[PDB]
Design a protein around this motif. Structure first.
Motif, PDB file in Angstrom:
ATOM      1  N   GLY A 183       1.252  -1.403  -0.335  1.00 55.82           N
ATOM      2  CA  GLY A 183      -0.344  -0.228   0.224  1.00 55.82           C
ATOM      3  C   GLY A 183       0.919   0.847  -0.234  1.00 55.82           C
ATOM      4  O   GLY A 183       0.524   2.506  -0.622  1.00 55.82           O
ATOM      5  N   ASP A 184       1.888   1.004   0.373  1.00 49.68           N
ATOM      6  CA  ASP A 184       2.757   2.924   0.186  1.00 49.68           C
ATOM      7  C   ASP A 184       2.308   2.932   0.963  1.00 49.68           C
ATOM      8  O   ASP A 184       2.391   4.486   1.006  1.00 49.68           O
ATOM      9  CB  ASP A 184       3.188   3.119  -1.062  1.00 49.68           C
ATOM     10  N   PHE A 185       1.567   3.307   2.347  1.00 47.70           N
ATOM     11  CA  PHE A 185       1.028   4.015   3.323  1.00 47.70           C
ATOM     12  C   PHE A 185       1.431   3.807   4.957  1.00 47.70           C
ATOM     13  O   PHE A 185       1.061   2.380   5.359  1.00 47.70           O
ATOM     14  CB  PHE A 185      -0.386   4.416   3.113  1.00 47.70           C
ATOM     15  N   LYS A 186       1.976   4.973   5.277  1.00 48.94           N
ATOM     16  CA  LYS A 186       2.211   4.735   7.418  1.00 48.94           C
ATOM     17  C   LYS A 186       1.846   5.790   7.497  1.00 48.94           C
ATOM     18  O   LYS A 186       1.473   7.236   7.457  1.00 48.94           O
ATOM     19  CB  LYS A 186       3.499   4.575   7.138  1.00 48.94           C
ATOM     20  N   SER A 239       4.707   3.778  -6.407  1.00 47.94           N
ATOM     21  CA  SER A 239       5.913   2.770  -7.120  1.00 47.94           C
ATOM     22  C   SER A 239       5.404   2.725  -8.172  1.00 47.94           C
ATOM     23  O   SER A 239       3.735   2.439  -9.261  1.00 47.94           O
ATOM     24  CB  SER A 239       5.021   0.945  -6.315  1.00 47.94           C
ATOM     25  N   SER A 240       6.512   3.306 -10.128  1.00 49.22           N
ATOM     26  CA  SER A 240       6.166   4.061 -11.017  1.00 49.22           C
ATOM     27  C   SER A 240       7.636   3.793 -11.532  1.00 49.22           C
ATOM     28  O   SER A 240       9.002   3.451 -10.653  1.00 49.22           O
ATOM     29  CB  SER A 240       5.763   4.519 -11.813  1.00 49.22           C
ATOM     30  N   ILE A 241       7.546   3.477 -12.857  1.00 44.08           N
ATOM     31  CA  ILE A 241       9.355   3.296 -12.985  1.00 44.08           C
ATOM     32  C   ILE A 241       9.300   4.921 -13.916  1.00 44.08           C
ATOM     33  O   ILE A 241       8.566   5.260 -14.317  1.00 44.08           O
ATOM     34  CB  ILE A 241       9.356   2.959 -14.044  1.00 44.08           C
ATOM     35  N   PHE A 242       9.965   5.749 -13.239  1.00 36.01           N
ATOM     36  CA  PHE A 242      10.524   6.680 -13.461  1.00 36.01           C
ATOM     37  C   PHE A 242      11.964   6.960 -13.326  1.00 36.01           C
ATOM     38  O   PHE A 242      13.098   6.203 -12.153  1.00 36.01           O
ATOM     39  CB  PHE A 242       9.896   7.631 -13.275  1.00 36.01           C
ATOM     40  N   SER A 248       7.698  11.406  -3.169  1.00 38.24           N
ATOM     41  CA  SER A 248       6.586  10.171  -2.554  1.00 38.24           C
ATOM     42  C   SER A 248       5.888  12.319  -1.256  1.00 38.24           C
ATOM     43  O   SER A 248       6.351  13.196  -1.792  1.00 38.24           O
ATOM     44  CB  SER A 248       7.110  10.004  -1.362  1.00 38.24           C
ATOM     45  N   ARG A 249       5.188  11.723  -0.984  1.00 38.01           N
ATOM     46  CA  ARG A 249       3.630  12.736   0.239  1.00 38.01           C
ATOM     47  C   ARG A 249       4.245  12.544   1.883  1.00 38.01           C
ATOM     48  O   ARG A 249       4.414  11.238   2.111  1.00 38.01           O
ATOM     49  CB  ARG A 249       2.669  12.862  -0.328  1.00 38.01           C
ATOM     50  N   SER A 250       4.448  13.464   2.243  1.00 37.94           N
ATOM     51  CA  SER A 250       4.127  12.971   3.169  1.00 37.94           C
ATOM     52  C   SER A 250       3.181  13.972   4.320  1.00 37.94           C
ATOM     53  O   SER A 250       3.444  15.659   4.454  1.00 37.94           O
ATOM     54  CB  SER A 250       5.749  13.467   3.938  1.00 37.94           C
ATOM     55  N   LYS A 251       2.714  13.855   5.707  1.00 38.16           N
ATOM     56  CA  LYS A 251       1.774  14.976   5.644  1.00 38.16           C
ATOM     57  C   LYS A 251       1.634  15.182   7.970  1.00 38.16           C
ATOM     58  O   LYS A 251       2.219  13.574   8.082  1.00 38.16           O
ATOM     59  CB  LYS A 251      -0.172  14.860   5.842  1.00 38.16           C
ATOM     60  N   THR A 252       1.517  16.100   8.021  1.00 39.21           N
ATOM     61  CA  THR A 252       2.199  16.223   9.459  1.00 39.21           C
ATOM     62  C   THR A 252      -0.154  17.109   9.941  1.00 39.21           C
ATOM     63  O   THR A 252       0.014  17.639   9.020  1.00 39.21           O
ATOM     64  CB  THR A 252       2.836  17.340   9.804  1.00 39.21           C
ATOM     65  N   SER A 253      -0.013  16.771  11.203  1.00 39.78           N
ATOM     66  CA  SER A 253      -1.124  17.037  12.115  1.00 39.78           C
ATOM     67  C   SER A 253      -1.366  16.916  13.310  1.00 39.78           C
ATOM     68  O   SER A 253      -0.295  16.508  13.704  1.00 39.78           O
ATOM     69  CB  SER A 253      -2.360  16.215  11.517  1.00 39.78           C
ATOM     70  N   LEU A 254      -2.296  17.665  14.120  1.00 37.72           N
ATOM     71  CA  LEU A 254      -2.341  17.981  15.446  1.00 37.72           C
ATOM     72  C   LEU A 254      -3.780  17.044  15.814  1.00 37.72           C
ATOM     73  O   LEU A 254      -4.857  16.801  15.066  1.00 37.72           O
ATOM     74  CB  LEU A 254      -2.815  19.242  16.016  1.00 37.72           C
ATOM     75  N   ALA A 255      -3.256  15.971  16.747  1.00 37.80           N
ATOM     76  CA  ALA A 255      -4.289  14.732  17.656  1.00 37.80           C
ATOM     77  C   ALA A 255      -4.354  15.522  18.840  1.00 37.80           C
ATOM     78  O   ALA A 255      -3.778  15.349  19.818  1.00 37.80           O
ATOM     79  CB  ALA A 255      -3.616  13.664  17.628  1.00 37.80           C
TER      80      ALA A 255
END
Length: 156
Positions: free
Chosen positions: A66-69, A101-104, A109-116
């Motif tokens: 899934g390439d998502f954490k 995931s691709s051939i290039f 990639s993307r990263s996001k931050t947030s408050l909990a």
């Protein structure tokens, strides 16, 4: 120096996004540590680790999953309401990462931050066994993320 307790539970989060998985709910485990500075006062630390619930597949000798954490970390004070009832608050931050995931020639990639922010309920049916329920929410301008945790704690 105070009483210490450990708590474990399953973490389920909901993310609004168009992609794999209809409910887009990350799967993971939540670890919570309780430290009491006083008889009726104490603090708790909740660590949530989740990942995309995608079945493992073999393609090109590489794993995607899934390439998502998604990671969450919250803490808050604990105050006893009654003899066997305790109330605590949750505050912290959340971090999510996504990779494609691709051939290039170049990779991205993307990263996001947030408050909990949230609250939790604790029930004490037995002296050495407690039930912990925590609610954590992350507020983003475009993406709304909710995290729910249900587990139990053991008093040393």
């Amino acid at each position: 120096e105070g009483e210490s307790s450990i708590s474990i539970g399953y973490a389920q989060s909901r993310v609004k996004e168009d992609g794999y998985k209809l409910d887009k709910n990350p799967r993971g485990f939540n670890l919570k540590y309780r430290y009491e500075f006083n008889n009726d006062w104490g603090v708790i630390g909740s660590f949530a680790q989740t990942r995309r619930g995608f079945e493992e597949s073999v393609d090109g000798f590489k794993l995607i999953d899934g390439d998502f954490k998604y990671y969450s970390v919250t803490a808050g004070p604990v105050f006893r309401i009654n003899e066997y009832v305790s109330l605590y608050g949750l505050l912290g931050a959340g971090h999510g990462k996504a990779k494609f995931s691709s051939i290039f020639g170049q990779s991205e990639s993307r990263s996001k931050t947030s408050l909990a922010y949230g609250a939790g309920l604790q029930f004490n049916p037995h002296p050495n066994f407690v039930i912990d329920a925590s609610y954590e929410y992350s507020k983003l301008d475009d993406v709304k993320v909710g995290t729910w945790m249900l587990g139990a704690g053991y008093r040393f």
